[PDB]
Structure 1
Amino acid sequence: LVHVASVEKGRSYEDFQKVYNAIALKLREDDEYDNYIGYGPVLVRLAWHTSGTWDKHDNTGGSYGGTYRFKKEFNDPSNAGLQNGFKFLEPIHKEFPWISSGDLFSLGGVTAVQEMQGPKIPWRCGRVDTPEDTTPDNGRLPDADKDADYVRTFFQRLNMNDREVVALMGAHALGKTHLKNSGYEGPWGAANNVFTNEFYLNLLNEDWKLEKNDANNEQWDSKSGYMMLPTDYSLIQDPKYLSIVKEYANDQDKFFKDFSKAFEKLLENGITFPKDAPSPFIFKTLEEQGL
């Protein structure tokens, strides 16, 4: 199967800029959510979980179809907590009903990263809604208590290499883990809603102890109050991952650049862009538009 991108009929850059804007403003205005973290991180996760189902071998899942809107995907245990992101975006969808679900879901992540001072993430449009029968089964998203060979292996199915994996992981600077959702509890860092390389810095410069949490899973905790999933901690256990973690903890700049490529790619996996499609869009932030 091939998924051809198909621009929403007669729409162009500034149409999408308006949708960025709406999302970016609600982000600004509902800022009490999760004890002041806001919606940015949960939108980033939604963007990733809606693309992260892709299977490179047969082209199933992925961001195209917006399948997250159907009961099966929406209630995947791996998706617990994301309801809040969909619930944020539902009113934005009603105001721009002409946008595909795939475009909304993925644009949400791109907006959230920029609005949190991350790099610009070129974004392309033309995900087309597909029917309920195209929804991938549960279980394509990664288990948290696994190791480096598990993470490398898992991410091969997304066509991501070592660099992309580590870059994309740095997204764990945003938000926290929530016991009721995933069986883990605690943020990865302090600058909870600002996109930085704090993730690689905390990985390397904290003294972690392995511990049981109240759900009876183990996680690596620091005296500072931070945590790391075993998959997170695996990135310093693997010598080839360690090297790239060092690079990013060192050069926020090279990380932003790499994350930007990986995210767009992640968000576009599975999609065939016809030869005469529009170039990727780069959207202005609220601050660039004087807010």
Structure 2
Amino acid sequence: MAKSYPTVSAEYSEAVEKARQKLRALIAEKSCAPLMLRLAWHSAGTFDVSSRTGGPFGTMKNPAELAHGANAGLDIAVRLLEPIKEEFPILSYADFYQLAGVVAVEVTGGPQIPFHPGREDKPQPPPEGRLPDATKGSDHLRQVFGKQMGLSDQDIVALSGGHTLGRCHKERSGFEGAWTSNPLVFDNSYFKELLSGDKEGLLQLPSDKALLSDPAFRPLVDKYAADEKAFFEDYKEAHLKLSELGFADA
């Protein structure tokens, strides 16, 4: 009951569905689901409840936000999706990029995340610096996900499982390597690899490792490594909340 979703026209809803189908095809065909999940997450994860600035309001289309260090390479994702966007002028960029994130999780075998349309495209990007720093630890994760975004510790650990997809690139973040051996499959392998420690051919960031040493995060890592169904359930809830930060709040 924390949300009151807006009424959109039948034509808006039809555009959502037709765009969803185009996104499902393109994301699968171009093998770019991890990049598209990162696009949606960096779009949403800048929300700060104290000022109600940032969040999933389409500002990743703005070159000034694409230029943030944390968003290196997301210009590729914006450009890859623009041909579809041009077919759906009614949709906000805000909705479109969150829909791409939901689709990215779906097409890689993850949970079906509910999608509610109606986000506005806001004119001002957030200030740079809201997103989590991969070199920092649990206090920082709680500042970013908790104090800024309003999400729970469970949400932090579940959402960190987004790293079950994809990899780091030396020219984007400067880190390099995949967390999992199957980076196009949405599964609980991220947590299994965290528990088994560092190993040749796979990467762990300091922020991933902070989940292992924190007394509240660690039980959640253990749970998701053992129980993919529980991971999917908690991930679905956390991604839904993330994708709607600042949007439709009652």
State whether TM-score is above 0.5. Answer: yes
Deviation, 1:252, is: 0.2
Corresponding position of 1:47: 40
Deviation, 1:272, is: 2.1
Q: What is the one-letter code of the residue matched to 1:199?
A: Y
Q: What is the one-letter code of the residue matched to 2:114?
A: P
Q: Structure 2 CA distance, aligned partners of 1:245 and 1:273?
A: 30
Corresponding position of 1:215: none
For the residue of structure 2 that corresponds to 1:92, the secondary structure is helix
Q: What is the one-letter code of the residue matched to 2:125?
A: T
Deviation, 1:6, is: 4.9
Q: What is the one-letter code of the residue matched to 1:44?
A: L
Percentage of pairs with the same residue = 38
* Contact 1:8-1:99 at 8 Å conserved across structures: no
Corresponding position of 2:190: 199
Q: Structure 2 CA distance, aligned partners of 1:8 and 1:102?
A: 14
Q: Give the 5 Å matches for 1:110-189.
A: 110-131=102-123, 134-156=124-146, 157-189=148-180
Query: Is 1:262 the counterpart of 2:242 in the alignment?
Result: no
Q: What is the one-letter code of the residue matched to 2:95?
A: D
* Contact 1:176-1:185 at 8 Å conserved across structures: yes
Normalised TM-score (structure 1): 0.81
Q: Structure 2 CA distance, aligned partners of 1:6 and 1:266?
A: 18
Query: Is 1:90 the counterpart of 2:79 in the alignment?
Result: no
Q: Structure 1 CA distance, aligned partners of 2:52 and 2:128?
A: 16
* Contact 2:6-2:248 at 8 Å conserved across structures: no
- 4+ aligned runs moved over 2 Å, structure 1: 4-15
Q: Structure 2 CA distance, aligned partners of 1:182 and 1:27?
A: 22
Q: Structure 2 CA distance, aligned partners of 1:52 and 1:7?
A: 25
For the residue of structure 1 that corresponds to 2:11, the secondary structure is coil
From 40, 62, 65, the counterpart of 1:70: 62
Deviation, 1:146, is: 0.6
CA 1:126–1:273 in 2, change beyond 3 Å: closer, same or farther?
farther
Deviation, 1:140, is: 1.0
Deviation, 1:7, is: 4.9
* Contact 2:13-2:117 at 8 Å conserved across structures: no
For the residue of structure 2 that corresponds to 1:181, the secondary structure is coil
* Contact 1:5-1:128 at 8 Å conserved across structures: no
Q: Whose strand proportion is higher, 1 or 2?
A: 1
Deviation, 1:200, is: 0.6
Q: What is the one-letter code of the residue matched to 2:71?
A: N
Unaligned runs of 5+ in 2: none
Computing the radius of gyration from Cα coordinates, the structure with the larger value is 1
Q: Whose helix proportion is higher, 1 or 2?
A: 2
CA 1:7–1:87 in 2, change beyond 3 Å: closer, same or farther?
farther
Unaligned runs of 5+ in 1: 31-37, 209-221, 275-291
What's the Cα RMSD here? 1.7
Deviation, 1:49, is: 0.4
Q: Structure 1 CA distance, aligned partners of 2:210 and 2:127?
A: 27
Corresponding position of 2:214: 238
| 1:23-48 per-position Cα deviation (integer Å, ceiling 9, x unaligned) | 11112322xxxxxxx21000000000
Q: Structure 1 CA distance, aligned partners of 2:168 and 2:16?
A: 31
Deviation, 1:117, is: 0.6
Deviation, 1:89, is: 1.0
Corresponding position of 1:99: 91
Q: What is the one-letter code of the residue matched to 1:200?
A: F
Normalised TM-score (structure 2): 0.94
